[PDB]
Amino acid sequence: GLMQFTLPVRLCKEIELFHFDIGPFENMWPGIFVYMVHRSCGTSCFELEKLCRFIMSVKKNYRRVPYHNWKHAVTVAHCMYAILQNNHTLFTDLERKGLLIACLCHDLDHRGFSNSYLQKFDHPLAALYSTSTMEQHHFSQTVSILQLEGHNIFSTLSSSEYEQVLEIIRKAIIATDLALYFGNRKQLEEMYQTGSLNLNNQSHRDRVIGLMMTACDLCSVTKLWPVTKLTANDIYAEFWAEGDEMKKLGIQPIPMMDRDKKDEVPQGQLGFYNAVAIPCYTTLTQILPPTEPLLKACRDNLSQWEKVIRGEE
Ligand SMILES: Cn1ncc(C(=O)N2CCC2)c1C(=O)Nc1cc2nc(-c3ccccc3)cn2cc1C#N
Ligand SMILES: [Mg+2]
Ligand SMILES: [Zn+2]
């Protein structure tokens, strides 16, 4: 109970900032997550023994893939930590509990392949889950781990609170299906601009949490340029492997996944910042003004990709 996690001075200070990188020391990531749960939620939110056992089982069920790995999970959780900490009063006790867990679990058992590839492969998961295939799997893996003996971190919650938090987690994980992001943001934009956005409306809260999940999931574009650039390498390492596997099925992959078209990556990133990232952080900043640093960092990285195209690097 009187056992706080404490980080070294540089991490203690920089972990509060949106652009924090969790670093290359894998063994410190569990402790970083617990630290964030303690400050974001409270030292009482979870039994430390159950939480630690949950974290280590989640880690074990992330795979050794270039991008959709345990580091991504903790990175996405930290961005949620920064949003929650800069929006103290806007979120319920159950939301703060569920959302850091949702982020840690949101890509559980990812193989480094898109929903499209599972469907074209005719993977069993595509028969079990026709839409948001991997995201329904991620939620299923989250429930599986929560039901392991000594892993039920929500055991103190009432039966109705337990159902509410698992519903927050399910919606939050489904929302990380980028196919659903476009429509979600359009609705939020209209609601904000016609002034009809109401944070007491549960359907509205659900939409806002969805956008937070997209924002956290894409947060590689909100880091300092060297982090953004080196993360982009891991992303394309997966995309190009999927492209190779598409070619093995006798299907020409989209250019994004074709390693023969490495040259077009800079222009591909511009499209991504303009069509997905900038719109995402703009709408998020309109709804949650203290998240503006994410939009500012995103714009800085768009400018860096423009410089790459002009051969200034
Ligand atoms: C940074 N970031 N973080 C997440 C994602 C992402 O999607 N994720 C995570 C799993 C799903 C990205 C990303 O980079 N996304 C895209 C890159 C891209 N390159 C080209 C491209 C076209 C032509 C030629 C070469 C590349 C097209 N593109 C479309 C994209 C989208 N959407
Ligand atoms: Mg995902
Ligand atoms: Zn993710």
Curated annotation (Swiss-Prot):
The active site is at H68. 3',5'-cyclic AMP binds at H68, Q269. It is found in: Cytoplasm, Cytosol. Residues 1-312 form the PDEase domain. 3',5'-cyclic GMP binds at H68, Q269. A divalent metal cation 2 binds at D107. A divalent metal cation 1 binds at H72, H106, D107, D217. Abundant in the putamen and caudate nucleus regions of brain and testis, moderately expressed in the thyroid gland, pituitary gland, thalamus and cerebellum. Plays a role in signal transduction by regulating the intracellular concentration of cyclic nucleotides. Can hydrolyze both cAMP and cGMP, but has higher affinity for cAMP and is more efficient with cAMP as substrate. May play a critical role in regulating cAMP and cGMP levels in the striatum, a region of the brain that contributes to the control of movement and cognition. The tandem GAF domains bind cAMP, and regulate enzyme activity. The binding of cAMP stimulates enzyme activity. Belongs to the cyclic nucleotide phosphodiesterase family. Homodimer. It is linked to Dyskinesia, limb and orofacial, infantile-onset: An autosomal recessive, early-onset hyperkinetic movement disorder characterized by axial hypotonia, dyskinesia of the limbs and trunk, orofacial dyskinesia, drooling, and dysarthria. The severity of the hyperkinesis is variable. Striatal degeneration, autosomal dominant 2: An autosomal dominant disorder characterized by striatal degeneration and dysfunction of basal ganglia, resulting in hyperkinesis. This is cAMP and cAMP-inhibited cGMP 3',5'-cyclic phosphodiesterase 10A. The gene is PDE10A.
